[PDB]
Amino acid sequence: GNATPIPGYVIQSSAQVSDDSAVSKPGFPTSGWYPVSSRSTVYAGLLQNGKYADPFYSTNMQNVPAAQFSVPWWYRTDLNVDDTSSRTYLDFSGVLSKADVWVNGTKVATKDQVNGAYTRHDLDITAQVHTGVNSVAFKVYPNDPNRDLSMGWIDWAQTPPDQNMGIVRDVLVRRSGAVALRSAHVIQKLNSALDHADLTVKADVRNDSANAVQTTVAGTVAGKPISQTVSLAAKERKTVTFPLVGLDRPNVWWPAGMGGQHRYDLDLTASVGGTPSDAAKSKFGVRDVKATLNSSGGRQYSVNGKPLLIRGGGYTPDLFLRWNETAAADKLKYVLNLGLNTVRLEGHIEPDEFFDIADDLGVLTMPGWECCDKWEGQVNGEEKGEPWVESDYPIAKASMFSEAERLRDHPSVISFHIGSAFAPDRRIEQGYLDAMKAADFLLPVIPAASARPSPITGASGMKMNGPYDYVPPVYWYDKSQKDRGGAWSFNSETSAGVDIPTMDTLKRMMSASELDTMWKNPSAKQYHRSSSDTFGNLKLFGDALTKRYGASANLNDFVRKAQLSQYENVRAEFESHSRNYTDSTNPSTGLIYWMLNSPWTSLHWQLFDAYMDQNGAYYGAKKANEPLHIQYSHDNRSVVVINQTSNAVSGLTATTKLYNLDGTEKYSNTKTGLSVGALGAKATAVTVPAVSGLSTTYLAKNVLTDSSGKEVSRNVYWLSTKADTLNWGGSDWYYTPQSAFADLSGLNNLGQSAVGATANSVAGADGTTTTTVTLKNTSGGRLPAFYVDSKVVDSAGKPVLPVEWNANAVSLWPGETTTLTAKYRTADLKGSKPSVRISGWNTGTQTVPA
Numbered sequence: 001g002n003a004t005p006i007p008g009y010v011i012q013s014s015a016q017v018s019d020d021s022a023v024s025k026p027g028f029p030t031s032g033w034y035p036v037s038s039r040s041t042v043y044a045g046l047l048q049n050g051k052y053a054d055p056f057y058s059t060n061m062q063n064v065p066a067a068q069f070s071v072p073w074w075y076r077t078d079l080n081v082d083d084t085s086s087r088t089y090l091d092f093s094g095v096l097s098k099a100d101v102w103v104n105g106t107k108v109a110t111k112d113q114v115n116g117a118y119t120r121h122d123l124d125i126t127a128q129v130h131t132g133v134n135s136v137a138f139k140v141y142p143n144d145p146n147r148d149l150s151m152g153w154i155d156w157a158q159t160p161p162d163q164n165m166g167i168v169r170d171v172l173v174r175r176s177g178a179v180a181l182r183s184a185h186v187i188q189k190l191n192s193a194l195d196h197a198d199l200t201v202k203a204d205v206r207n208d209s210a211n212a213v214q215t216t217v218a219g220t221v222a223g224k225p226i227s228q229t230v231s232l233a234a235k236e237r238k239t240v241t242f243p244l245v246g247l248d249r250p251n252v253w254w255p256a257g258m259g260g261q262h263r264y265d266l267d268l269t270a271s272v273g274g275t276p277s278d279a280a281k282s283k284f285g286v287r288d289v290k291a292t293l294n295s296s297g298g299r300q301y302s303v304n305g306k307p308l309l310i311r312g313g314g315y316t317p318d319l320f321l322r323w324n325e326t327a328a329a330d331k332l333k334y335v336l337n338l339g340l341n342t343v344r345l346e347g348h349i350e351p352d353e354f355f356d357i358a359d360d361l362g363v364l365t366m367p368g369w370e371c372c373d374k375w376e377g378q379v380n381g382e383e384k385g386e387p388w389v390e391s392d393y394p395i396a397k398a399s400m401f402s403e404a405e406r407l408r409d410h411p412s413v414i415s416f417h418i419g420s421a422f423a424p425d426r427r428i429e430q431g432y433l434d435a436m437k438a439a440d441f442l443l444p445v446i447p448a449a450s451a452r453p454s455p456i457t458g459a460s461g462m463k464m465n466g467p468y469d470y471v472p473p474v475y476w477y478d479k480s481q482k483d484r485g486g487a488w489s490f491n492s493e494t495s496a497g498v499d500i501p502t503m504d505t506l507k508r509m510m511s512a513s514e515l516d517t518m519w520k521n522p523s524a525k526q527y528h529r530s531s532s533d534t535f536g537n538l539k540l541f542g543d544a545l546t547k548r549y550g551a552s553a554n555l556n557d558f559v560r561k562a563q564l565s566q567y568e569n570v571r572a573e574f575e576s577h578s579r580n581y582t583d584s585t586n587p588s589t590g591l592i593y594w595m596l597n598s599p600w601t602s603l604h605w606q607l608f609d610a611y612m613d614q615n616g617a618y619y620g621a622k623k624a625n626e627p628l629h630i631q632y633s634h635d636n637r638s639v640v641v642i643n644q645t646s647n648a649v650s651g652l653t654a655t656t657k658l659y660n661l662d663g664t665e666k667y668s669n670t671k672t673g674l675s676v677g678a679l680g681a682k683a684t685a686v687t688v689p690a691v692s693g694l695s696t697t698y699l700a701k702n703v704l705t706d707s708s709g710k711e712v713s714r715n716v717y718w719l720s721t722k723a724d725t726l727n728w729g730g731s732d733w734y735y736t737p738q739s740a741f742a743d744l745s746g747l748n749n750l751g752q753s754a755v756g757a758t759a760n761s762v763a764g765a766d767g768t769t770t771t772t773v774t775l776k777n778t779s780g781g782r783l784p785a786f787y788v789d790s791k792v793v794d795s796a797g798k799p800v801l802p803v804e805w806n807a808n809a810v811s812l813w814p815g816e817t818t819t820l821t822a823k824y825r826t827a828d829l830k831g832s833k834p835s836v837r838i839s840g841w842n843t844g845t846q847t848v849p850a
């Protein structure tokens with residue numbers, strides 16, 4: 001019943017190994033080999049040892065010779081075996097791209113068999129294993145994402161020098177008797193009332209001994225005892241199906257905010273001769289999911305019978321696939337701190353623990369294959385990725401079986417994308433559907449994340465029309481352009497491009513001269529944007545920032561304007577889709593922001609940066625996604641209330657006020673007695689009229705109060721009397737140019753205000769600290785304290801990260817007070833007392849003790 005991951009390896013280039021057979025012989029010398037932990041790419045292993053500077057800074061990654069990664073590298077380990085009575089197996093996946101496998105001088109598997117990142121291998125090495133010191137070695141071949149059914153980085157970042165070659169999941173050493181237990185899972189089916197489920201337990205037993213046996217498979221499913229006895233011929237594998245098990249009042253799994261995140265346990269042992277031979281423990285959730293096309297042709301998800309608007313981001317692992325379990329949890333927790341409900345994984349499908357965490361937190365996941373490389377090479381024409389040859393087909397199908405077997409019992413998974421870009425052809429699709437059936441993977445299959453249909457499954461119900469680069473806030477409210485990215489159908493991957501991180505992050509990833517070029521010449525190429533020619537620079541972003549904000553006087557000026565622009569755009573992107581969700585015709589049914597995060601330190605396509613810091617894009621997404629939310633429509637000036645929560649809400653008041661930048665109120669409307677339905681429904685409070693006398697740049701202050709009088713949402717917009725307008729005829733695949741630009745440059749001369757700050761911290765018994773900050777606009781005039789950003793810092797003024805605030809980037813009118821709460825691990829203070837840095841657009845910067 002043992003399965004123990006190999007904790008580490010020593011690695012070296014095959015340039016240093018003239019005899020392959022020598023490596024896995026006990027006693028082979030490994031002087032100058034690099035010790036690496038489990039789940040290391042070659043380059044990640046070299047970084048672990050010294051060997052190159054931080055690729056997260058400047059052009060360090062460019063200085064790595066890539067030629068050394070065009071030959072195989074060895075991953076070698078010893079294994080102590082005290083007792084060879086039990087059979088021994090190597091059970092693994094995550095090999096990029098393929099490998100020969102050696103035990104004690106014998107090649108047990110070749111790169112023709114061990115091939116493809118997602119394929120699982122269960123190699124019986126019993127005949128090679130002896131008592132005492134054994135040795136195992138993998139010769140890992142170079143990875144080319146265009147040639148290998150593997151992982152590549154598309155245009156998200158820059159290419160890792162080793163192209164991620166290595167072993168990026170665990171290799172398990174399994175020990176068992178005559179019978180191996182494998183692939184234990186639970187088929188679960190809930191009634192529509194959600195008060196009764198039926199559980200079908202299935203498990204494979206394989207008799208690897210020389211003689212026929214009887215084996216009993218027995219244990220517990222969801223607290224209920226189960227047992228089957230089968231006969232097995234020598235070398236026979238069988239799937240055991242247990243009689244149906246009913247479960248009353250099941251603890252149903254819900255997405256975060258809709259109920260609990262319970263998972264039941266499955267615990268089985270296969271016994272031979274009244275003695276345990278092998279054992280397996282797993283979990284599953286009792287949850288129904290569906291994803292169907294609505295009458296308008298949009299893909300509509302529902303969980304447990306409740307339709308949902310998908311509100312998420314494209315998730316990526318680290319650029320060098322460096323795995324850390326706490327980091328994965330910190331990233332999924334930020335999803336909820338954002339108010340988001342979903343992450344999409346375009347390829348790069350994370351180890352099991354990532355899905356365990358998403359299960360435990362109630363974050364929905366959308367895994368699938370990626371575009372623009374080998375996966376779509378048979379159907380994607382002139383795009384990157386090679387045509388398929390006959391040997392490709394069984395690798396892809398085994399990759400599908402393996403991932404379907406891994407993912408089937410994680411309730412967070414709401415679908416699998418079998419295509420991205422292009423839907424698979426009939427042959428490929430059939431092999432994917434066959435593999436999923438064989439795995440009992442019963443979740444929705446989506447053919448493409450674009451509008452392209454597959455021959456069997458059919459219409460995707462999704463769109464990939466862009467944009468991926470600057471478009472003004474009003475763009476997102478478009479429904480008229482059927483080949484563009486407005487708020488209708490399922491937006492599977494879209495953003496307004498550039499997302500300048502915080503200054504603290506900037507100073508860690510770029511030199512002073514790289515930063516100087518960034519603000520002085522946005523048209524210049526930035527290594528920390530993209531290898532793509534199209535996304536190599538920040539020109540569209542820089543042009544609109546100047547036009548709309550005003551020319552940047554310095555680096556500080558550029559970064560501050562970037563944050564407002566990013567907050568403004570990301571907010572409108574999400575808010576437009578929340579609004580249109582309940583449209584009768586062509587509703588929005590999903591939005592995946594491109595992207596949630598970056599593989600590395602980046603200037604684009606992120607909400608949170610590589611260090612987990614939180615900028616304007618972060619705060620703007622968090623504002624748009626709050627559970628009871630008030631918002632302003634950029635297209636028609638409607639003020640709209642959204643209720644994300646699982647219950648209808650009544651007696652809400654929506655209060656909207658316009659102010660000139662001198663603080664003069666120019667309009668007020670108070671709309672009382674609003675009711676809004678659950679799970680994404682809306683109510684319109686008012687349409688703001690054209691108001692005479694507004695400054696060119698003006699403020700809209702929107703406030704939602706419940707029936708108790710509590711303020712539950714505040715949303716402040718900086719607006720212009722001059723419209724952003726689109727030149728739709730100049731549209732390209734990744735953006736639409738503007739025919740005219742809003743004028744928000746009035747903010748440059750917004751007069752100074754004042755805050756107003758007191759902070760205190762409590763170190764909890766759960767290992768976390770909560771810092772509470774009370775901020776007040778203490779000025780003596782009519783000016784708001786606008787866009788006030790509070791940051792937990794140590795004594796050196798460095799941000800404590802990760803961190804989760806209840807609210808931030810707040811605006812307060814004179815005399816107004818807000819109390820804010822930040823939570824973080826006490827240990828991330830690293831012994832420092834906490835302080836709070838408070839910076840506002842028109843309030844300066846101060847830091848206070850906490």
Ligand SMILES: N[C@H]1[C@H](Oc2ccc([N+](=O)[O-])cc2)O[C@H](CO)[C@@H](O)[C@@H]1O
Pocket residue numbers: 154155156346371372420421464465466468493733
């Ligand atoms: N799925 C990818 C998406 O792929 C596309 C392929 C073709 C078209 N097209 O021809 O309109 C549009 C998008 O492109 C994004 C931006 O380049 C990538 O970052 C995503 O990973």
